[PDB]
Write a protein that binds this ligand. Sequence first.
Ligand code: HEM
Ligand SMILES: *[C@@H]1O[C@H](CO)[C@@H](O[C@@H]2O[C@H](CO)[C@@H](O[C@H]3O[C@H](CO)[C@@H](O)[C@H](O)[C@@H]3O)[C@H](O)[C@H]2NC(C)=O)[C@H](O)[C@H]1NC(C)=O
Ligand SMILES: *[C@@H]1O[C@H](CO)[C@@H](O[C@@H]2O[C@H](CO)[C@@H](O[C@H]3O[C@H](CO)[C@@H](O)[C@H](O)[C@@H]3O)[C@H](O)[C@H]2NC(C)=O)[C@H](O)[C@H]1NC(C)=O
Ligand SMILES: *[C@@H]1O[C@H](CO)[C@@H](O[C@@H]2O[C@H](CO)[C@@H](O)[C@H](O)[C@H]2NC(C)=O)[C@H](O)[C@H]1NC(C)=O
Ligand SMILES: *[C@@H]1O[C@H](CO)[C@@H](O[C@@H]2O[C@H](CO)[C@@H](O)[C@H](O)[C@H]2NC(C)=O)[C@H](O)[C@H]1NC(C)=O
Ligand SMILES: O=C(NO)c1ccccc1O
Ligand SMILES: [Ca+2]
Length: 595
Amino acid sequence: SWEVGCGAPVPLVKCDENSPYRTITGDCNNRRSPALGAANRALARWLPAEYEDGLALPFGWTQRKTRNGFRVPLAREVSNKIVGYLDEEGVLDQNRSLLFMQWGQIVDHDLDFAPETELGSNEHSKTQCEEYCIQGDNCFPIMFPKNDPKLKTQGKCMPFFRAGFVCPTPPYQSLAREQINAVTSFLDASLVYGSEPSLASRLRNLSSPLGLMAVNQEAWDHGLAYLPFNNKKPSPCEFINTTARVPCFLAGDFRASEQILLATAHTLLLREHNRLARELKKLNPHWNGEKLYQEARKILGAFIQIITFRDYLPIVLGSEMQKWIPPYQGYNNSVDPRISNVFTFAFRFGHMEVPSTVSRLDENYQPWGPEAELPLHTLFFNTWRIIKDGGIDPLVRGLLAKKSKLMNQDKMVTSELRNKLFQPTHKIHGFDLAAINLQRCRDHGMPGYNSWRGFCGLSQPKTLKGLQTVLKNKILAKKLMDLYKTPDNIDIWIGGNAEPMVERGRVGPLLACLLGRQFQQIRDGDRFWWENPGVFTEKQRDSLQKVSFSRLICDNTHITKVPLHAFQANNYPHDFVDCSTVDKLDLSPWASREN
Ligand code: HEM
Ligand SMILES: *[C@@H]1O[C@H](CO)[C@@H](O[C@@H]2O[C@H](CO)[C@@H](O[C@H]3O[C@H](CO)[C@@H](O)[C@H](O)[C@@H]3O)[C@H](O)[C@H]2NC(C)=O)[C@H](O)[C@H]1NC(C)=O
Ligand SMILES: *[C@@H]1O[C@H](CO)[C@@H](O[C@@H]2O[C@H](CO)[C@@H](O[C@H]3O[C@H](CO)[C@@H](O)[C@H](O)[C@@H]3O)[C@H](O)[C@H]2NC(C)=O)[C@H](O)[C@H]1NC(C)=O
Ligand SMILES: *[C@@H]1O[C@H](CO)[C@@H](O[C@@H]2O[C@H](CO)[C@@H](O)[C@H](O)[C@H]2NC(C)=O)[C@H](O)[C@H]1NC(C)=O
Ligand SMILES: *[C@@H]1O[C@H](CO)[C@@H](O[C@@H]2O[C@H](CO)[C@@H](O)[C@H](O)[C@H]2NC(C)=O)[C@H](O)[C@H]1NC(C)=O
Ligand SMILES: O=C(NO)c1ccccc1O
Ligand SMILES: [Ca+2]
């Protein structure tokens, strides 16, 4: 008996085996093993976890224990000496729009979420961790180096809490610690609809038989919907501006308001569901609410799948695309569709793609107002700039017309994220996402850089010189050695991202392998994959492959000019055409006759 037993975070129910619709939780996708890919289950392990005590303590916890003979460097040190930089000039990606970064975050949020541990509201725990920086239980602080300016200004550490895990929440004790994925592993738009029946239902408009999602009642965007506000106070969104007092939005995913451009994409998707559902009510007047909801939902999930696999993946993986994701051959019930623990770190290549500012453009795509270009850090958990400063059209135009940041070995992550991150649970704009990613690697018990190179069949450098040749960078390799003392101890997030980009792509070999395997598996092991015979009809398929992010914008905003290939860098006005030139989604194939 393999470690097959434990199952408890978990909400349990029965499977209607002939339902043409996915469950909200992901259960029932695989017929022989119904829990596969479901939400609130453990992240899969492609390799055994590596903890300090073999079971649960992260490396770096016990200051005297080493990793292969050496102390592991402080997360914030590595951040300071390797990841930071000062000059934002020359840093933009010349052939990827801001939308390229933004889509990655959306896909990521549909596939994985490992929430921090809670246990204790009205507990000195949240206090003992932030106020005193005392390591202990789920408090695993990021200590500041000596010479770090945050020491003079912020305190002795940045609080950090370990990720939730399967089985409990209490002192669990024997088999290795496994973190939770709170969302469904299938690319199914769970970030729009929710992963729990509890939330899925609350998101819906059930007082009307139209199969629509609830929309904001306090505010409108020139007649277009906004996501509803969240009930819960205190909300970090009203905190960043107690005068405006505008709460975070309520969406299928809890991270929706982390930054204004993410909330903007969530709004576009909410609108498409309603557009689709009312458009479907027109062709099938007899269909009921539930049918409208499920059928629009199914359509929206196919859209996310199509854009991801047809438009997005090919420009991340480049020439490695064909190597890891061969053409679709059909559903394979033997494939594990679960998202792996390491994927959630590999997919973090996106953090190095975020630029320092966000712009709002007017109708001619020229600056909108006098304070049109804003620093990223003022937009974390900011919903007021949307409700009170022009709606989403100005931000959407920036998404289309501005560029992503390009990964650069000398310029990894912007200070907006590296020194000024705002955490929903705390009150300063002073966190470091890079140090957090590093610390989280250790928290999730990740094998080191060389373990993953071997897994992907790549050479494994043992020397500084071996490491120079792989990174193709003498000094980066050297700072890496000085901090880590052996390439075996290099945290995967930084190791993976330090490698040069493959041809036509935006990640290196190690990441291409880790990303590509994962995507191949969630496609091949998804019974509801859009191309799987029987999910949609042939005619429905011919209609779905004409979707494009450009059309989505046209139908759901007041923007009338869009580029044809939204993910590449596009210059206004030459690369911008009229919305009426853009292929629409033909829903006639969804018309039924029941006589
Ligand atoms: C602010 C943040 C972003 C933009 C300004 C941002 C952006 C991205 C991109 C573009 C990603 C992929 C293409 C991506 C992936 C994942 N992130 Fe990240 N992200 C912002 C902020 C955060 C924060 C805060 C976290 C949590 C860090 C922690 O470990 O505590 C974060 C994480 C992740 C993540 C893991 C999700 C999970 O499985 O739990 C990605 C796959 N991002 N982000
Ligand atoms: C900026 O990036 C653009 C998109 O990545 C790129 O254009 C793309 O170039 C590739 C070259 O491989 C072509 O790829 C397509 O080739 C044919 C289409 O003629 C198809 O049969 C293939 O399946 C594949 O999709 C495309 O012509 C184009 N890709 C897309 C999706 O439009 C530009 O070259 C880049 N610009 C610069 C200046 O480098
Ligand atoms: C917190 O949110 C506040 C309200 O949203 C915001 O104040 C608002 O923004 C500015 C003040 O700086 C004013 O906007 C402008 O309005 C017209 C443009 O249509 C101009 O002609 C005006 O001169 C003015 O500059 C709003 O009047 C103002 N609203 C209120 C109620 O004060 C704050 O700036 C936000 N504070 C922080 C710290 O973010
Ligand atoms: C649920 O749907 C109903 C019906 O579509 C929404 O109410 C309508 O929409 C707007 C704003 O309320 C107005 O044109 C009418 O007052 C309503 N028409 C009808 C037929 O009721 C309602 O806003 C939705 N509720 C939520 C919470 O989203
Ligand atoms: C369905 O997926 C399974 C699991 O990934 C595939 O298994 C392959 O089959 C060989 C033996 O025939 C196994 O050793 C490997 O796990 C897989 N091959 C390789 C090269 O790794 C299987 O091929 C798939 N089945 C179908 C019908 O496509
Ligand atoms: O935004 C996030 N990820 O992309 C995020 C992830 C974990 C915790 C909170 C957050 O805001
Ligand atoms: Ca999902």
